């Protein structure tokens, strides 16, 4: 209902008011009534990095390493008006002993793009295990030979090409890996223009009908911001209306707590107005 021009006026009003932040604060963090059981089974507990960030049973990724478990969710953002779905797999920064499962997901679905929205360590703590090798070095995870063929960077992110080799069959798979390093946990990007640049890079790398694997440390805060922003941009180019609270709810229905702080939400809303006004 209503238009792009109209939703954007509505969004601006709500930022100025500000009712958008109130409604965000009132939005549920977990979808009422969705079971979270497998993630808390005894054999699975230590495969979670955070005790409070767990996948729903219904949307959790099933390992075709088979009847195993991983802290990862399917997250599909439908833009019905454009007949469009942007598939994601949203996951935590792997643990030393869950690395093998992380590469199993990438291999089972032949994901070609990985987006990592965290540094490995932050403020005295480990936020993610380094599951890829620093060249020249090479590493093995659960029957996968991983080598980093290429490294380049901007001020905000590192772009890496990786080669994944099945050690049984000798089959090879290539993956693009993007690590945004200028975006602290529980916060906003250090630079908004780099962020928008980055998100457009991600969209241009996206393969249709193939999920993009997106993670940060917990896989809900900064990933949620990124999924909202990519959704908004697909809508803007198609002159379709944008309702960021509907976008966040639809994410939260598939993985709990996406877009963690009010500051993150306020940030992505302002970026959405920014992109719209500069393309007008």
């Amino acid at each position: 209902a209503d238009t792009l021009e109209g939703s954007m006026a509505q969004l601006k009003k709500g930022l100025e008011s500000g009712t958008v932040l109130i409604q965000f604060e009132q939005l549920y963090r977990k979808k009422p009534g969705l079971a979270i059981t497998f993630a808390k089974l005894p054999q699975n507990l230590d495969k979670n990095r955070y005790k409070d960030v767990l996948p729903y049973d219904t949307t959790r990724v099933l390992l075709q390493g088979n009847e195993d478990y991983i802290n990862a969710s399917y997250v599909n953002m439908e833009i019905p008006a454009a007949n469009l779905v942007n598939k994601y797999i949203a996951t935590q920064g792997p643990l030393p002993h869950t690395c093998a499962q992380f590469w199993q997901v990438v291999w089972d679905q032949k994901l070609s793009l990985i987006v990592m929205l965290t540094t490995l360590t932050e403020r005295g703590r480990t936020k993610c295990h380094q599951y890829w090798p620093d060249p020249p070095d090479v590493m093995n995870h659960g029957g996968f030979h991983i080598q980093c063929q290429s490294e380049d960077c901007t001020i905000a992110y590192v772009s890496r090409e990786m080669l994944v080799t099945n050690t049984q069959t000798g089959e090879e798979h290539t993956v693009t890996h993007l690590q945004y390093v200028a975006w602290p946990a529980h916060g906003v990007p250090d630079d908004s223009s780099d962020f928008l640049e980055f998100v457009n890079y991600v969209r241009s790398l996206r393969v249709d009908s193939e999920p993009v694997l997106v993670h940060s440390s917990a896989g809900i805060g900064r990933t949620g911001v990124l999924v909202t922003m990519e959704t908004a941009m697909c809508l803007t180019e198609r002159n379709l209306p944008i309702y960021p609270l509907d976008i966040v709810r639809k994410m939260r229905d598939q993985r709990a707590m996406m877009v963690q702080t009010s500051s993150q939400y306020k940030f992505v809303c302002e970026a959405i107005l920014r992109v719209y006004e500069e393309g007008l």
Partner: peptide, 8 residues
């Protein structure tokens, strides 16, 4: 495990 839930 530390908790990832914060305030702000």
């Amino acid at each position: 495990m530390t908790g990832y839930v914060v305030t702000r």
